[PDB]
């Protein structure tokens, strides 16, 4: 029961244990050269 | 106050400042308190002079 401006879903496939690196605010790999989120983010991850 | 280090410069030349906002605030609240104790403290002397 919010209401949003719009939505917007990203996907890609990565190795498994690196989903740690997903989350803002963290560097590593992905987080580095290949996908970066801003700190403030808004929103979930999900992953399986 | 709590912190790591009560120098600035050390903690802007350490962390990430998406962390170091954790270490700063706690500066903050140090600092702005102590300033607020002698700013009342001078009014006092002033209302007595």
């Known amino acids: 029961d919010?209401?949003?401006?719009?939505?917007?879903?990203?996907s890609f496939v990565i190795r498994g244990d690196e989903v740690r690196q997903i989350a803002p605010g963290?560097?590593?790999?992905?987080?580095?050269?290949?996908?970066?989120?801003?700190?403030?983010?808004?929103?979930?991850?999900?992953?399986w | 106050f709590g912190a790591i280090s009560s120098v600035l410069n050390d903690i802007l030349s350490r962390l990430d400042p998406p962390e170091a906002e954790v270490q700063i605030d706690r500066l903050i609240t140090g600092r702005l308190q102590?300033?607020?104790?002698?700013?009342?403290?001078?009014?006092?002397?002033?209302?007595?002079i």
């Open chain 1, 2 to 10: 919010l209401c949003f401006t719009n939505v917007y879903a990203d």
């Open chain 1, 26 to 47: 963290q560097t590593g790999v992905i987080a580095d050269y290949n996908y970066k989120l801003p700190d403030d983010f808004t929103g979930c991850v999900i992953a």
């Open chain 2, 34 to 48: 102590s300033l607020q104790t002698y700013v009342t403290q001078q009014l006092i002397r002033a209302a007595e």
